Amino acid sequence: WDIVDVANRWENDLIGWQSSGDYMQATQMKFTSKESAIKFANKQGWDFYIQEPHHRKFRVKQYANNFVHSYGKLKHIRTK
Amino acid sequence: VNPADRYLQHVSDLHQYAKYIMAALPKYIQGFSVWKDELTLHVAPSAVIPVTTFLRDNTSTQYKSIIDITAVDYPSRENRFEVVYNFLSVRHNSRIRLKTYATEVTPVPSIT
Amino acid sequence: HIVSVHRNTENNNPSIPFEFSPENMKRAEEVIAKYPPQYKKAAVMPLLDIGQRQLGYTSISVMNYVAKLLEMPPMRVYEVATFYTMYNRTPMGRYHLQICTTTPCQLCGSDGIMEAVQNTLNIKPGETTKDNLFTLSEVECLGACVNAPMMAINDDYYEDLTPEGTVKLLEDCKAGKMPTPGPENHVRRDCEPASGQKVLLSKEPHNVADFLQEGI
Amino acid sequence: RQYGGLKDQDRIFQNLYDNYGWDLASARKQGDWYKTKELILKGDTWIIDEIKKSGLRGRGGAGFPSGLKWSFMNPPGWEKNEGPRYLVVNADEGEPGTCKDREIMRKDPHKLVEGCLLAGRAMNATAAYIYIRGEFYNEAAVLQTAINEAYAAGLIGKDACGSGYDFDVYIHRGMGAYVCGEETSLIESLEGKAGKPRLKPPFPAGVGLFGRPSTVTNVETVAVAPTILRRGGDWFASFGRERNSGTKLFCISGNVNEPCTVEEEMSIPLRELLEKHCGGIKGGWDNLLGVIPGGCSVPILPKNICEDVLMDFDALKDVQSGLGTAAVIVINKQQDVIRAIQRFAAFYKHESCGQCTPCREGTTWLLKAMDRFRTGQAKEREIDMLYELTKDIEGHTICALGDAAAWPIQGLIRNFRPEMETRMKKFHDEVGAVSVGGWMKDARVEKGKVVGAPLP
Amino acid sequence: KTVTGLLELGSEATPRIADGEAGTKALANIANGGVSFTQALGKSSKDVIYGEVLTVNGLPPVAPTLAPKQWKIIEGEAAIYPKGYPCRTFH
Amino acid sequence: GEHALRRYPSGEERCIACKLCEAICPALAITIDAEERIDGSRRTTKYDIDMTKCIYCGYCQESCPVDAIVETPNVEYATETREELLYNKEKLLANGDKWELELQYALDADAPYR
Amino acid sequence: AEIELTIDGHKVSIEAGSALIQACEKAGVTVPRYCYHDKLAIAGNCRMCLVDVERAPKPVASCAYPVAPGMVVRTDTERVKQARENVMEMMLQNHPLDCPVCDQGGECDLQDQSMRYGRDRGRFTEITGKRSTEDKNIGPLVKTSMNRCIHCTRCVRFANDIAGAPELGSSGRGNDMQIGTYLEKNLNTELSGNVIDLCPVGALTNKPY
Amino acid sequence: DAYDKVDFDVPVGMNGDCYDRYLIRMAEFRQSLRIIEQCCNDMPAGAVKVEDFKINSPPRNLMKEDMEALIHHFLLYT
Ligand SMILES: Cc1cc2nc3c(=O)[nH]c(=O)nc-3n(C[C@H](O)[C@H](O)[C@H](O)COP(=O)(O)O)c2cc1C
Ligand code: SF4
Ligand code: SF4
């Protein structure tokens, strides 16, 4: 749940406990599927935003990449 | 020694018993699972009263005592709740579980 | 042990200048030309050695300056001269006792040699004399193993030793005159049996010019 | 068929004792640079043909046959890179027991020069680098004077002996690291970084020095090359056994009455090695505690079976051990073996480059256990445990320094276990009893130090 | 449908499958749902019904217990109550 | 019984603010804020226990590697206000001060069994 | 343009010449590691990703072994589980007891892989004990506590390659290898607070936090 | 939980009343006392927790000197 700006958290008079009036701040659900989460979310009648994931771009790596022959300027010094 | 090694023979016995029960009621038993010394029959909701009756009344089963029945919600499924039933045969000293499903709105039939 | 981290007390500064004597710059320009003109950096191992020939040791001014000369950051030459044993980084005296203590020397009385050295002086294997003439260092295998107890001073090895004979040799070097260019006091040549020679019993080598194969 | 006691004209080197002098005319009537012209104009494959049926195994310690090592360097599209190809001669050694490489370059620099060109023709190499140990100052001066008189004679250089063939010998001096004797750490030390080994599936024959293809072969095995090119391959193959064939420099040291270095045929019994040319053992044949063929990096042979043993690759690896470089360090019975192997483990801890974690974290633990076992602050199971943690280092490293450091400890535990337990019970009732890790029960940590224990 | 597969193809103890190349595609249609389960019960032999589904004598298998407990009522004066009390020792 | 933050010999607070007692507490009674102090040493700025939601499982004492918080066998500290029953860092340091002679006796007999 | 092989019975296709660790990540197979990273060069330092490969005598490092056709890879070999416990116990011998004071408590790679792959107990109990590394003041942004370094080279590879600040490096042999500027030189670059998310152990960490 | 190894008998009433439910408790007292003396006689030595430190904690002797055990102690509690 997105936070409420007045009800999120405030520090106590007394000891400085984090007090809250928002009650869905600790609830968090797990779903197997994205369409599972969407079906449950509009089945319960909730306004939702969905965030698309970001995976890593596949790039081919070789260990022999590290020491290929310099014809011109070296322009780099490896360490290992 | 592995603690799961002491179960195995009985677990094989349990497998055979369950393969019989599915063969005896093909209209009503969607599946079964044997984990380790624990049998679970997977049965549909409109199929629960013909199965429990069988489990109460067949001389091989005789699951007389109701033990504990409850629900578990998986919110990622279409049918949100699954309803589990635990039975004890004090004659044959054996337990069984019966799992059906239910949505928030649709019922399960009562075995009271 | 390897000691790495640099203390900046004084006499090891980037503030302190250093550059080659023109003989050593002659040698340096000769040395860099041995490698391809791309890979100039490959010549930093001999050039630091050249700096080690000029100064008593390898300071940080020498390593900074050779990093200036050869298209390099100084951490890349800090790695190179920290990885190697022979780049002595803290100042020593004139002679550098290198006594080998590994098993072919140990089975042949290298301990008698080393305490015959450190009874003569009173110094321990990392310590310098405060005359700054001798610095002891116990060292691994110096490649003279059949010459079975041995040691090294600067570039010359001294072999087949006796604890009677090494106090002899170091009273020779504390007088300034160098004892022998030879490897021991003259019991064999290089690798002989001390008996004599069992093998190569001739006065002219056999030419292999007639023992040739037919295929040429 | 009694292998042993070769003649004199079947020797490969004739200056190994210096009666003939090292200079160039000394090398001419020694018999070298005699028909260089004709063998350089012979084909590269005919050189590799001859080296292949020679049976020339590797003399760096690995033992790999260098006919197939020299023919791995040219896949059939090798001219399709068309640049410079390099040769590297490993003239470094610091392996304990060994001096045979100093014996090559002090005595015979010239047929090293020759074999460098002859192998560079065999591999179509552009140049060659000699890597001598930086400890060997006078030896490097020896070799530079000899290759500059090879330049003056026109025998190598712009056009080597009138052949149209490029060749440069340069000499690089490595300032005191023993891990740089390995192929790939040698390759890296020549490129000018810290001399650490790389991983193998970038093979150096494919991808190597300066990013250009390269081989690293030992100073001996190319100093033998022009001799066996001249004499022919089957005259070399007559010596030794079926796959173990030919000659070898043997440097026999340690506790012999007469330490010396030999040139002797392979597959030879160890008893008529040690008594024929070494005087004998200091105290006779019963004064043998153990024997190390090869350098630091192979296990002990105990006395029972090293009477029966041949000194090839075959009869040592079925004795769970290696020929290595055939340095033979015999052990006096009046000397201690666990002091010696503590010294070996300290050598491996000092000479480890420190790159991969099992070798670098293993050599320190091997030393910390071997000092503790030398004085004896141990339980009798910890020797057991010591075996386990040599099995941990054994095959999980980059280079072969890790299994080099594994092996002498394994030979000690296999062959001298009651030798260790005698010292341990000697500790057990000279002093009180000990826990695991060397702790006694008065031993406590007070301010700074540890007190209560004599701390090995 | 895996119990149909166990009834029609067989078992790893009891393989009723020749034609390994064709046994994969014989697996396949049951994995697609070609056969149904009561069709498998009708197709299958009587001694496979009496071997794998039922007991070898043709009886239903009894509800299994791990460790069976055989009772032994102690009734003499080793009992906890003498006779006349409405509670018994069962051991 | 009640809680105490012990001290070292020669007086040092022992609580290196590792948050383990907070992470394990089954009733979420512990709350800690931690800051690096002037020495560069890691200490708690703020330590706090609610004794109204404490359940006396002893997990906070079992968890601490330094053994900084312990349970003293005092049960006789019954109060009249809730504010008195919220123990900050200072009340618990005063407790670990007061009961230290006793906690010697407790941990001389417990520490092998732990 | 692609190569098909087998990991754990799974059949996987990957672009030619890639790393075996990339084949394992594509097939869903979890392989533990300490000195491999997507945005960095390949080093074979930490020896953690050893893997059983048919037609190979020794377990090979999965991060620098290139992909070849007809390849059969096993990760659940008894030899591989033994190798992972061995290399873990080797890592843990000189690594100091700083887990209550380390900043990577629930975020230590070493620590979460020590449960899943490492040994239960420890046999390190010498009197002489672990080594100790001098603390190295780098700068005001990076707190630096180098007893708990595992020499993964990852910071050095990064500041070499991408940050363009060549002041980091590895100076020494054996256990006396250190990872820092050799002179006690301050490290600048425009992204120097990125080396502290990169170190898997807490040796380089956040100074205001 | 080692009720195989301990010998005892069981009281079972006959009429379904509160009196036999009382009598079987008064006898289960006796049977529990029989368990207690058989378990004090037959107590063995050995570990009291399970053997591995990945499901319950190492002892404080060990986790204050062992690196592995400090890792396991830190993780079983967070
Ligand atoms: C730690 C280590 C040190 C080595 N030192 C040497 C050496 O000093 N001299 C040598 O010839 N080979 C040495 N080797 C073996 C080298 O790798 C050798 O150059 C190569 O493996 C074989 O070359 P070859 O074809 O002549 O046998 C060493 C290997 C390792 C792992
Ligand atoms: S085995 Fe040891 S010395 Fe060799 S590369 Fe690995 S860590 Fe370095
Ligand atoms: S009392 Fe113990 S567990 Fe709590 S923060 Fe302090 S040291 Fe950690």
Ligand code: SF4
């Ligand atoms: S005794 Fe239990 S509830 Fe109380 S503070 Fe400690 S861990 Fe929390």
Ligand code: SF4
């Ligand atoms: S980095 Fe090391 S000391 Fe710090 S928490 Fe992780 S395992 Fe413990």
Ligand code: SF4
């Ligand atoms: S400083 Fe950190 S990232 Fe760099 S090698 Fe050391 S532990 Fe790894």
Ligand code: FES
């Ligand atoms: S072992 Fe002493 S120098 Fe070779």
Ligand code: FES
């Ligand atoms: S990550 Fe593959 S070995 Fe370090």
